[PDB]
Symmetry: C2
Subunit: 412 residues, 2 copies
Amino acid sequence: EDVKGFFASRESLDMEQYLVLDYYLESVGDIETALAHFCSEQSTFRLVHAAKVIDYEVIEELEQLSYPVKHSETGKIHACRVTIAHPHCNFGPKIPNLLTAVCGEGTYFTPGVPVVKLMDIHFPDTYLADFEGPKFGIEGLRDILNAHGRPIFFGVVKPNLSPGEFAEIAYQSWLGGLDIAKDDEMLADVTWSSIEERAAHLGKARRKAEAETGEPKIYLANITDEVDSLMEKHDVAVRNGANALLINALPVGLSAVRMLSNYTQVPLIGHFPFIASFSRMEKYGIHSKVMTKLQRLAGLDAVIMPGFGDRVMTPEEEVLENVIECTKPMGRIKPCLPVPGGSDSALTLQTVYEKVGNVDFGFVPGRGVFGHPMGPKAGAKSIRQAWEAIEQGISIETWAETHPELQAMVDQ
Amino acid sequence: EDVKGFFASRESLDMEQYLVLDYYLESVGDIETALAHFCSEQSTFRLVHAAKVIDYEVIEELEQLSYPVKHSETGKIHACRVTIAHPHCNFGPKIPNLLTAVCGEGTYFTPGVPVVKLMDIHFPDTYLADFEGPKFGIEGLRDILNAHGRPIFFGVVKPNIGLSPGEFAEIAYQSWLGGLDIAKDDEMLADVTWSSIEERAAHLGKARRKAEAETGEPKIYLANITDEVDSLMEKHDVAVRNGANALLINALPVGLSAVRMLSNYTQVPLIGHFPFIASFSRMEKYGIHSKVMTKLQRLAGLDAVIMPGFGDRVMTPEEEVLENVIECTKPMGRIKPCLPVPGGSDSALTLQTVYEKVGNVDFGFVPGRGVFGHPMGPKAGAKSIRQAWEAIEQGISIETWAETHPELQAMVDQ
C-alpha cells in the first residue's frame, strides 16, 4: 500500500528523462494520497514510467472548491501548488501525445482532485533536441524587414471587401511606414475573397510599396483551413506575394502547425482564437503561457496574443509571462516574436515598450491607423512619429507639436 | 446607434444560410448593446456577413459575475441565454474556420461580455451536405461484430502501460474468449520505443484472429494511433496491415481537422477518446459545452465516441452525459449516427442502470472493474458481463441470475 512510490527528490532522478510540470490543484481528503492518485492517473508504479511528485506547497485550507464540481469525495479541501516529474519516454517528441499525458483524462478526472490548472511546462535539452522550432524567429523576421532596434509594426486592414479595395488600404499603410499588413483571423478562403484573388492584388501592392519606400514590406495572409489543405494554401499564397502566413494555432491544432512549419518557405505567425475557453479561469484549465510555449515549440515565428490595457480581459502579469515564453532561452529553439495586441495606438506605444523592457515585440494599433482622420497612410505615419519621439526621449505631446499626423491623434 | 441591425426574426432569414448557436453569457451594461457588440465581434453590419440575435432570454440580474474575470466595464450584470444566427458563408465547411468564428477571439473578448459558454450548435442540411461524417457509424460497427440487439462490450486491457506486446496479447485474448467485443489500447499508449505500433499490432492481430476461430464470433482489436498529424496515415497502414480492425484517436489533442482527414482515408472504424475536452467544458457557465465537441467529433467522422459516463464518482453531471449520448445518435442530416460509449464506474453490476438511463441498446459499455481484476481472471470477468446482459434480457435480476452463474456470483460477492 504505497503512496510514497510516487514521490521522489529531483536529485534522485535523471532529469534529462523527465518533463517538469507545475499544477495548481484542489485536493479532497489526505493530500499525499490525492497527489499519488494524480500521478498514477496520468501515467501508470513502474520506476521508468511513473510520473513523480518532486515538490509541493499547501497554500491554504478551503471551506469549498473554487468552482462547483460534481464529486462524491469526502474530506478536507486544500489548495496546492505541485511540481511533477513526468518521464517523456511515455509520449515522445509528439505534440498530441504530450497533450494527452499532461492535460488529458488523468489530469482532470482523478478522484479527489476536481479542480486543476496546468501552470507551466519545462522541457530538458534532451527532449527539445527532437524538435525543430521556428525556422525564422525574431531575427529571421527582422532580416526580412531590415527592421533593427525598433518594434515591428502590424496593421490589421479594416474593413473585411474585394481584393482590390483591401489592396489600396494596405498600400497606404505600408507607404506611411507599417511593416506588416494582415488579414483578419476570421478572413481566410471564401467566396467573395479567395486566397488566390486576395494574394495576387496584395502581392502587387506590396512590391509597389517596397519600390516607392525603398524598404521591405510584409503581406501576412491568413491560410487557416482544413489540415489537408494547408500546404496548397501556402503554395498559392506565396506564389502570389504573401511573404508571411497567419494560422489560427488551436483551431488547426498544434501538430498541424508543426507540419506547416517544416514545409513553409516563409515565416508563420499564430493567432489566439479558442485559447480563452480553457485559460480564463484563474484556478482551472491551462495557463495561456503553456500554449504560447507550445506554439513556439511547434514552430511559429511570431505569436499574436492579448496585450496591455484596462479593456483587455487578461491580467497584465499574465501578458508579461507570455511575452517572456516567446523570447527566453529554450535549448536551441529560436525565439519567436511576441505580438501583444491591446487597446493600442500611437499614444500607447511608450507604455508597451516600457512594460516589455526591450524592442523585441510587434505592436498592433487597434485604432488610429486605419481610423486616423487623415487616412491609413497618416495613421501609419503617426505610429512611426511616436516611435521616433520615444527614441529621442521626447514626450509624444512635444513631438506632435512639429508633426501634424501625430498631433491629429493627440487631438482625439 | 444600430444595435438593432444585429437583431432579426428567424422568419425574416433564409435559415439554410445560417448556423444556429446557443450561448449562455453574462453581460455588463445595456443588454441589447452588449449583444450587438457580441454579434459584431464574431463577424462584422452587412446583410450577408453579420451574425444576428434571433432570440434571447434575460435569466436574472446578478450582483457579481459567476467567475472574477479582469474587466474594465461597469454597469448592471445580467445572466442571459442567447440564440444567434451565424451565416456560414463566413467560414465554409471547414472545421478550423468554424471554431475560429463561434468560439474564437470575438466569442471570449467582447467588451462587456466577460463570461460566455457556447451551449449548442444546430447545422442546417445545406451546411451538412459538404461533410462526410462517419464512414461506418453504429450500424457499420454492429455489422463488423455481428452484434445486434445488445450493447457493444469494450475492455481496456490492463495493466495499461509498460507491458510487452506479447504480455498484452494473452490478456486481450482471454477477454475476447470470455465474450468481449473490443479490446483496446490505453489512450496514453500509442507508438513508443518499448511498445511500437508494429510489434503490438502483429501480436494483438494474431490473438484476435485466433479468438475469432476459437469463439466463432468476430472480434475487434482497437489500436491507439494518436501521433503527429503527418504520421497518422502511415500508422493507420501499419496497424491495419497487422490486424487492428479499428483505430483509436485522441480527438482534441490531434485536432478535429486531422480526425476529418484520417476519417476520409481510413479503411476501418475510428473511435474518439476524450482527453483535453474537460479543460474548457467543466465550468458550468464558461467555455464550451461537452455536447458540442461530441457533435463535432461525429461531424468530423468518428464512428464511436468514448465519453465520461454514469456513476457518482464521475465528475460530469448525469444530465450532461445523457445530452452527449443523444448527440451521437440523433438525426443530423445524412450524417451517420456514431456509437456513444459512456465510460463510468462500471461493472456487470451497473449494466442494467446504464441500459435503463440510455433507453435502448445503442451504446458501448466499458467496465472499469471486475473484468481484468475479476477474481477468476480476464476470461471470467468478460463472462460475468455477458451473464449480466442475459439476465437483463430475461428480465431477471442480477442476483437471481448469479445463483446459477458462478462468474457473475463472484462479482456480487466482492
